[PDB]
Amino acid sequence: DCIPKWKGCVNRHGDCCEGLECWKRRRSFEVCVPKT
Amino acid sequence: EDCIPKWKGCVNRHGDCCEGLECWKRRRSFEVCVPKTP
Amino acid sequence: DCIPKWKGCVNRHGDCCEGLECWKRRRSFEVCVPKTP
Amino acid sequence: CFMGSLALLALVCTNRIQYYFLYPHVTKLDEVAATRLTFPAVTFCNLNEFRFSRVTKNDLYHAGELLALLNNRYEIPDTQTADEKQLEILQDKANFRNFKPKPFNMLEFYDRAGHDIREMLLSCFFRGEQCSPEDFKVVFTRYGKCYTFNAGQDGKPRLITMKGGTGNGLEIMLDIQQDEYLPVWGETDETSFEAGIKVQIHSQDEPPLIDQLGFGVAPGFQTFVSCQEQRLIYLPPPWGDCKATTGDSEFYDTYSITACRIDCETRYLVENCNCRMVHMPGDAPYCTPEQYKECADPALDFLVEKDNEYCVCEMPCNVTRYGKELSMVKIPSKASAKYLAKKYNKSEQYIGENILVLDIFFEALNYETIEQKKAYEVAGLLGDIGGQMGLFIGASILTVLELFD
Amino acid sequence: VVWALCFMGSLALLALVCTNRIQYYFLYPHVTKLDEVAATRLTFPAVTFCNLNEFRFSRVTKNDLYHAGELLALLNNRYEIPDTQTADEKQLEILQDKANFRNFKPKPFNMLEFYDRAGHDIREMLLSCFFRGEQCSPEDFKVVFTRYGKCYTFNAGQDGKPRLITMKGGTGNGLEIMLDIQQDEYLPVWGETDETSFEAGIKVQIHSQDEPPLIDQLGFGVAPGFQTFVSCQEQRLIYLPPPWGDCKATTGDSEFYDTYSITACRIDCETRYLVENCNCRMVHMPGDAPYCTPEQYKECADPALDFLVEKDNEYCVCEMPCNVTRYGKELSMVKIPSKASAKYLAKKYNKSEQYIGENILVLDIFFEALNYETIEQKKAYEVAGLLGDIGGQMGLFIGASILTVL
Amino acid sequence: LKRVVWALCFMGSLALLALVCTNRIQYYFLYPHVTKLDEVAATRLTFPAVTFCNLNEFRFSRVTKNDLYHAGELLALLNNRYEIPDTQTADEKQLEILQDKANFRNFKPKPFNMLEFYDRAGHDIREMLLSCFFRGEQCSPEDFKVVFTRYGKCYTFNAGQDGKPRLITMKGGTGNGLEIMLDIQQDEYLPVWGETDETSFEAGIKVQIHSQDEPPLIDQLGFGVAPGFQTFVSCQEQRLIYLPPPWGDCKATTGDSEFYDTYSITACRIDCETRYLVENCNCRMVHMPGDAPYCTPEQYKECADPALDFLVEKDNEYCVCEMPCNVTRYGKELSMVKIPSKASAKYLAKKYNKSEQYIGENILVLDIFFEALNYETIEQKKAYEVAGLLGDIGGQMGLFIGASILTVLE
Ligand SMILES: *[C@@H]1O[C@H](CO)[C@@H](O)[C@H](O)[C@H]1NC(C)=O
Ligand SMILES: *[C@@H]1O[C@H](CO)[C@@H](O)[C@H](O)[C@H]1NC(C)=O
Ligand SMILES: *[C@@H]1O[C@H](CO)[C@@H](O)[C@H](O)[C@H]1NC(C)=O
Ligand SMILES: *[C@@H]1O[C@H](CO)[C@@H](O)[C@H](O)[C@H]1NC(C)=O
Ligand SMILES: *[C@@H]1O[C@H](CO)[C@@H](O)[C@H](O)[C@H]1NC(C)=O
Ligand SMILES: [Cl-]
Ligand SMILES: [Cl-]
Ligand SMILES: [Cl-]
Secondary structure, three states: OOEOOOOEOOOOOOOEOOOEEEEOOOOOOOEEEEOO | OOOEOOOOEOOOOOOOEOOOEEEEOOOOOOOEEEEOOO | OOEOOOOEOOOOOOOEOOOEEEEOOOOOOOEEEEOOO | OHHHHHHHOHHHHHHHHHHHOOOOEEEEEEEEOOOOEEOOEEEEEEOOOOOHHHOOHHHHHHHOOOOOOOOOOOOOOOOOOOOHHHHHHHHHHOOOOOOOOOOOOHHHHHHHHOOOHHHHEEEEEEOOEEOOHHHEEEEEEOOEEEEEEOOOOOOOOOOEEOOOOHHHOEEEEEEOOHHHOOOOOOOOOOOOOOEOEEEEEEOOOOOOOHHHHOEEEOOOEEEEEEEEEEEEEOOOOOOOOOEOOOOOOOOOOOOOHHHHHHHHHHHHHHHHHOOEOOOOOOOOOEOOHHHHHHHHHHHHHHHHHHOOOOOOOOOEOEEEEEEEEEEEEEOOOHHHHHHHHHHHOOOHHHHHHHEEEEEEEEEEEEEEEEEEEEOOOOOHHHHHHHHHHHHHHHHHHHHHHHHOO | OOOOHHHHHHHHHHHHHHHHHHHHOOOOOEEEEEEEEOOOOEEOOEEEEEEOOOOOHHHOOHHHHHHHOOOOOOOOOOOOOOOOOOOOHHHHHHHHHHOOOOOOOOOOOOHHHHHHHHOOOHHHHEEEEEEOOEEOOHHHEEEEEEOOEEEEEEOOOOOOOOOOEEOOOOHHHOEEEEEEOOHHHOOOOOOOOOOOOOOEOEEEEEEOOOOOOOHHHHOEEEOOOEEEEEEEEEEEEEOOOOOOOOOOOOOOOOOOOOOOOHHHHHHHHHHHHHHHHHOOEOOOOOOOOOEOOHHHHHHHHHHHHHHHHHHOOOOOOOOOOOEEEEEEEEEEEEEOOOHHHHHHHHHHHOOOHHHHHHHEEEEEEEEEEEEEEEEEEEEOOOHHHHHHHHHHHHHHHHHHHHHHOO | OOOHHHHHHHHHHHHHHHHHHHHHHHHHOOOOEEEEEEEEOOOOEEOOEEEEEEOOOOOHHHOOHHHHHHHOOOOOOOOOOOOOOOOOOOOHHHHHHHHHHOOOOOOOOOOOOHHHHHHHHOOOHHHHEEEEEEOOEEOOHHHEEEEEEOOEEEEEEOOOOOOOOOOEEOOOOHHHOEEEEEEOOHHHOOOOOOOOOOOOOOEOEEEEEEOOOOOOOHHHHOEEEOOOEEEEEEEEEEEEEOOOOOOOOOEOOOOOOOOOOOOOHHHHHHHHHHHHHHHHHOOEOOOOOOOOOEOOHHHHHHHHHHHHHHHHHHOOOOOOOOOEOEEEEEEEEEEEEEOOOHHHHHHHHHHHOOOHHHHHHHEEEEEEEEEEEEEEEEEEEEOOOHHHHHHHHHHHHHHHHHHHHHHOOO
């Protein structure tokens, strides 16, 4: 089920919970964060 | 041979430039005949 | 006896003459120099 | 009918009052050399967070995943890029069979395993006075354990300099200890592709944001940083946008943009993660390695790069900027290599990789001021406009007699 | 009858004020206003870069070599490989094969197409890209031809793409790219021409979108094997035209460039000059005219252009613009990679540890806390200020007259 | 008494004149200065002087037995025993050369002059300079004037002295500036067995860009350029003018610098340094001006080096340099690319007859040029002088006078 805030969305980019998008980071692995 | 015209390589003959031209060494490349500079 | 101005105080730091302290230098060996307020 | 003209010249005031109602500012410039000049604070970080030799089994157990030396299985990943000998050591270190975990504190970890100014600092001089590791105050940053020269805190007075040039500035020689660098098997906020240090030159009243605002210094070079101090003063409203320091920051004493940002970062991290990072101010549990990974790192990364809504920092009324000119020469020379190798008991090649010299000093003109001043204050307006102003009252009071005639 | 004698007075005093300051109007003084601040939001500049190598060795064909060989100093006038060749074994076996024209029939050749095809590819060079924590891609770079060949521009702000902005100071809110410069793809240097380089690395220019790059003249270097931090401050300069100042009165008389800039003025002149002398324009030049052939480059264009910039001070006169955007820069460096990260990078990009050390660089271009400075020429004395200043001494004498009228 | 509304019309109008003609004059005596700024591109711009030094003082191949005998201890190649110390870090190959060189058996010392030593054994611009261009004109070792510095024998481009005119540039960018290529000759570097003021851990050069009227202090004020790189230095010239008292602190001098024609802070410092060294050591160092015996190696070691080090770093009492009324500053932006590329290495190796590796260690290219806006002025001007204060007074009483005439009628 859906991935909550600040958690790794790695390998599933669509699985973020609502209001969240899966965001790739400069120095690290992608995570679910608030939409902007 | 005869005189070397504008923009042409004056390499190895520095005096052979045509009139109004001097043989000019370039920073990045081989020397060429160019207009004289006041 | 006491080490005078500009001379090496190396290995004896207390042997400087009066008014002088033994000073370590950035690029070189330590020397006796005038005291600094 | 100057009873028309006194109403006419009511325009002259009407304009030149309106200009004062604009509250004009002029910005004054001066560029000079100060007889004496207050040396700035110099903060630097090793680009490596944790000394390999100082990382224990307990450390590895708690912080391993964070540093990408372990997976969620508390195992050493096959992706490991390690050479033979470090892999040997790490597998041993990573063996948890019949191991009972002790308590773990992120701050203590940074503090113990962070690079030690006492090991790193080969030589130090300020103005020809020799200086020591005890001249450096420890400050925690995103980079881990960092050091600040001339921090001007704990009642130590700020250092000064009366002369321009290398000889009157700060010169340090460092060993960055690559051999002590943690192996990089993956990419986290705690890992680095780079060897060297980060440096920030700042006024003592301004805390460092060294990962954002810093500059680099590479090993195998002597780096000259020639500075000019520039002091900027702004007016508050009505004249300008600024905000005066005292009492304007939650966790800090003077107001600065960096101070405002660290405040926000701290609050945000506390709201989202319930903890604060090791380098943050305030009173709140320090995040655990897991909190770092599942909450704090993500929330902080997001806050600085992605989020433009949350932190609103007004411009300070007082800013101290340092102009910098960097240049480089090689270290060591073929001729000096063996001498250094012998002296520090290192291989010639080690010296070439790990050794740097840093010279921070001021040029002849060390001092520039850019200051907003009020262009029109309560003399100019009322002097001319307000002066002839009563003259129309003079005209009216008079011309009332043209009525009472 | 001294009531007229005092009328001579208010007439006298008036004009002997009225001349003076109304001479001072015609001195046309300017004051130059300064302010240095942080902008709530700031418009990120255009970032243009070039590989120092013009043509990828692997992309140079037999036809390419045939036409452009002499130019690159890989061939002599004989269409042969010179004995001066410094090449190692393997590259000559390749080049000698490539250079074998026996029963070879030359196809058509275009300098532009050559640059375009054989130039380094942003898609190969760009390992990572971020702007402000948004990830960015090769399609964020617009191709721009320069003297260096095929170059790329970030945030070019053209083709209707809007210009990027930043509200915050520091690395995290700026541009960070990681590149592989591909030395293994560098053309061998057997001689010295304008198309050859002793150096490995890239050239970069940070410029306002309204100003085209002259990156060989005005650019800066970034070396491989380092992370380079470039801390910027934007500085916006405004000048007055005559009578008050020198700046261009009629701006952008070219249809070549939407805006007037010194670089624009120079590229215009360079183009005209090259067209007059050589009958062709270089690949990176604007306008409508045949692109010079490799031979034209060598016998005409290169020489004429070199001469024009370095030797000739008569031909190009560029008036100063009324609007200039300058970027203050502070560069610093750390090493890449560390011994600890080397193997990880080697593995990741499928390259030898040493290759990484030679070919890999990281570039961070961002703004410091105070990103914004203005230096602006304003008119010190204008008419209206003049009206108000000389308004009083007339505002008497008119009414003084208005009593005495007959 | 609508007489009184005329009576207070003159009354407080006069008090206005007295009010302003007071405040303005008070201002005048405050001697206010305004500082004027302008930033532009000059149609033509005077190129600065470029001085550089090798970081190595003495070529190993040029050091003789007599040289070693006198200057050995100073360079830390010898002890007080005139012997080669066991601390020596040398490789076997240089060690033998040096032991031979260091053998004084039946050796009779000849005379020795520090200056001549620097001059002869110093690096030679003719060996170091592989290529030179200014603005596309090719330039030669004879375009560099020799100048002695703490670093030993150094060279200055466009020094603008000996009646040579100063070079100019009308255009921005690399092509119109100075580009030199150097070989720093590490193989010629003196071995470092210890730490003195005459020894260096670093390989490369030091450079100082300065106005021709200002002598170099290149160890204090210089910048670095590393081998194995092409370094671009983008410059902007900034010209600062100050007012003297009452308006400001500055000074102008001609000959009021005993050793120099124009006044500059560097000039003032070299004066002091020279005086101080003469008082303390009785000699002057090789790079100092004036008339006085050049210090011997021994004097350098026991007196001059210590006194000079002490004077610059420790002593803030002795030299007090007033600020000049005229200062020329150069804004600089440095950047770097690598030299050589793998592709160019063998070509350079072949061309200079050096190993590929040698090139990588010893070779650098330096480009010093101006950006498009090359010229900035920051100038203190007098804000209030007679013409303005008069024009205010005259235009002020010029009101009162007229506004009186009205009363002078009705
Ligand atoms: C700004 O800061 C400095 C140090 O805090 C202070 O001395 C100065 O007075 C301030 N500027 C002004 C003019 O308010
Ligand atoms: C010098 O380094 C070696 C490394 O093998 C070490 O054994 C020795 O203890 C070191 N000497 C000093 C000064 O401790
Ligand atoms: C200056 O030019 C910039 C673009 O180059 C433009 O956006 C701005 O409006 C101009 N300012 C003035 C005062 O002309
Ligand atoms: C300052 O000095 C330079 C020469 O050193 C001279 O050309 C210039 O006129 C002087 N500037 C002023 C305005 O004092
Ligand atoms: C090339 O260098 C070698 C060794 O340094 C030397 O023997 C030879 O004379 C040099 N060749 C030329 C052409 O000078
Ligand atoms: Cl922030
Ligand atoms: Cl041009
Ligand atoms: Cl001094």
